[PDB]
Design an enzyme around this catalytic site. Sequence first.
Site, PDB file in Angstrom:
ATOM      1  N   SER A 261       4.897  11.121   8.615  1.00 53.71           N
ATOM      2  CA  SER A 261       3.800   9.748   9.855  1.00 53.71           C
ATOM      3  C   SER A 261       4.180  10.419  11.512  1.00 53.71           C
ATOM      4  O   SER A 261       3.597  10.243  12.084  1.00 53.71           O
ATOM      5  CB  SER A 261       3.941   8.685  10.043  1.00 53.71           C
ATOM      6  OG  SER A 261       3.760   8.307   8.434  1.00 53.71           O
TER       7      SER A 261
HETATM    8  C1  2U3 Z   1       4.480   7.808   7.354  1.00 53.07           C
HETATM    9  O1  2U3 Z   1       5.618   8.577   7.333  1.00 53.07           O
HETATM   10  C2  2U3 Z   1       4.140   7.258   5.906  1.00 53.07           C
HETATM   11  N1  2U3 Z   1       5.007   8.478   4.728  1.00 53.07           N
HETATM   12  C3  2U3 Z   1       4.267   8.475   3.508  1.00 53.07           C
HETATM   13  O2  2U3 Z   1       2.855   8.255   3.409  1.00 53.07           O
HETATM   14  C4  2U3 Z   1       5.446   9.130   2.924  1.00 53.07           C
HETATM   15  N2  2U3 Z   1       5.991   8.287   1.882  1.00 53.07           N
HETATM   16  O3  2U3 Z   1       5.759   7.085   2.134  1.00 53.07           O
HETATM   17  C5  2U3 Z   1       6.823   6.455   0.862  1.00 53.07           C
HETATM   18  C6  2U3 Z   1       6.388   5.869   0.150  1.00 53.07           C
HETATM   19  C7  2U3 Z   1       5.659   6.853  -1.196  1.00 53.07           C
HETATM   20  C8  2U3 Z   1       5.464   6.724  -1.897  1.00 53.07           C
HETATM   21  O4  2U3 Z   1       4.306   7.409  -2.846  1.00 53.07           O
HETATM   22  C9  2U3 Z   1       5.469   5.197  -2.547  1.00 53.07           C
HETATM   23  O5  2U3 Z   1       5.407   4.987  -4.040  1.00 53.07           O
HETATM   24  C10 2U3 Z   1       6.644   4.739  -1.943  1.00 53.07           C
HETATM   25  N3  2U3 Z   1       6.786   4.979  -0.637  1.00 53.07           N
HETATM   26  O6  2U3 Z   1       7.638   4.085   0.177  1.00 53.07           O
HETATM   27  C11 2U3 Z   1       5.718  10.369   2.937  1.00 53.07           C
HETATM   28  C12 2U3 Z   1       4.844  11.272   3.946  1.00 53.07           C
HETATM   29  S1  2U3 Z   1       5.091  12.779   3.886  1.00 53.07           S
HETATM   30  C13 2U3 Z   1       6.488  12.418   2.234  1.00 53.07           C
HETATM   31  N4  2U3 Z   1       7.408  13.337   1.695  1.00 53.07           N
HETATM   32  N5  2U3 Z   1       6.217  11.198   2.390  1.00 53.07           N
HETATM   33  C14 2U3 Z   1       4.316   6.077   6.235  1.00 53.07           C
HETATM   34  C15 2U3 Z   1       2.702   5.396   5.763  1.00 53.07           C
HETATM   35  C16 2U3 Z   1       5.119   4.499   5.304  1.00 53.07           C
HETATM   36  N6  2U3 Z   1       4.788   5.567   7.800  1.00 53.07           N
HETATM   37  O7  2U3 Z   1       5.572   5.497   8.488  1.00 53.07           O
HETATM   38  S2  2U3 Z   1       6.163   4.606   8.911  1.00 53.07           S
HETATM   39  O8  2U3 Z   1       5.970   3.121   7.567  1.00 53.07           O
HETATM   40  O9  2U3 Z   1       5.519   4.152  10.508  1.00 53.07           O
HETATM   41  O10 2U3 Z   1       7.171   4.985   8.733  1.00 53.07           O
END
Ligand code: 2U3
Length: 496
Positions: A241
Amino acid sequence: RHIAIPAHRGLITDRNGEPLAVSTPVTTLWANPKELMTAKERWPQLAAALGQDTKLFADRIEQNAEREFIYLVRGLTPEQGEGVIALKVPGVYSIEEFRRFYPAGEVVAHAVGFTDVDDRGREGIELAFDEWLAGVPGKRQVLKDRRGRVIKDVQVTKNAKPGKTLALSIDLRLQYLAHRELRNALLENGAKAGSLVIMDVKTGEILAMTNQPTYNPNNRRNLQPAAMRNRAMIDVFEPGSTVKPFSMSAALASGRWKPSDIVDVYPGTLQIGRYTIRDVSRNSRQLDLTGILIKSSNVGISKIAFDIGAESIYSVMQQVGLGQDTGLGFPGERVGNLPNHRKWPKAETATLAYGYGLSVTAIQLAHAYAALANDGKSVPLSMTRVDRVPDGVQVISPEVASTVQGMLQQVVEAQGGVFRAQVPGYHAAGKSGTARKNAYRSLFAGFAPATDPRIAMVVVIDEPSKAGYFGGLVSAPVFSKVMAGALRLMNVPPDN
Ligand SMILES: *[C@@H](O)[C@@H](NC(=O)/C(=N\OCc1cc(=O)c(O)cn1O)c1csc(N)n1)C(C)(C)NOS(=O)(=O)O
């Protein structure tokens, strides 16, 4: 018949002249075995004074009886060295050598680095600027007979030229703060590792670069490999993100989008063939562009990416330095990867937009945020003090960069925003990230003061092992603490 005079290695200071690596005199003892063999009754006292075993020492000399030169010990303190010379053992000679002392020790271990047994740069700045710091060894003429007795130091063939002083861009005051807060954050979060980079957005200077775990470069035994890794320059990771502000810059530069435009992200998922783009929070329908960044909607940014095309996004990311050579010339520094296509498929377009599948270093991420903070101008990265600032490259238009700055300020300050990144007294701007490697990396990238940016910062927390793992929960409070201290250490007037 001719020996090498070791040169004094150049002093490394921080940007204010505080010493970081200092050449310290050490005594190297060597022997002419042929001569030692005529004073065997003296060997046990000599063995003790060098810290060697009696029989092992006598075994070593007997084997080399025909040799005209052998080393006894290297790097004794000149005081320990005096004690051996006081023994007055025939055939024992001394050479004045240099060993580095690192006054700030573990605090700036990865950036400064260290020297090998030969006083040569092995890691960090010591390695990168080894030629500048090393100088040139000396050469002298000596009179030696058949038994190998060093009769007289006849004349100096060439005098040793000392190394040159080097002032780093690092501010030890900001370095101490970054080190301390990153260490405390790792312990509180039970994290495997972490990195923190501070940059001056105007000059391209790296003001602080710390990693956990760290090591004491003055303790030359044990040295654990994993602890010596300069993760900020060597560990690649998916920025996730934290790349969305760059996708947004390309959207605003395309002429097709303005901050008040809306994107319908309902139901919080979007099917692209076999792949499904999913948001974390899935209780939104219409979101404006700022809302897409506040909520960190993968769906919202993907929909914008399909409209403008991946080429415009790749170009912004490439121009800001993501997956690109930093030009710092640190051997072993990782470049990472920014994927590229002639024909971008829909899935690749979306994943590029939300930082999935690309690999960057904390330094590249910090440099990219610096360009955005510096009104879209990228100034070359420097690990040395910049007195005359080079011309920057306008990578993002000033208007677009200023618009993105305002949105990132709302990410931190708005309702539902990353409140833990707020810097009391100042307007701060930034973006959190969470990258699933279930093992994750917590990320926060930002800058301040939001109204006239001075510093950019990136906090990377690797594998937090507590209830909260999101970038907004784990890394955002480290940015808050380090930024509050760094702006005040630099006498940045509060802008709130
Ligand atoms: C942005 O950082 C974004 N992160 C992601 O979409 C990514 N991972 O997410 C976490 C996640 C993924 C899953 O598939 C799952 O089952 C559970 N999770 O918690 C990501 C992007 S690149 C990468 N290798 N992973 C988001 C939406 C979480 N927003 O970041 S923040 O909340 O603003 O920090």
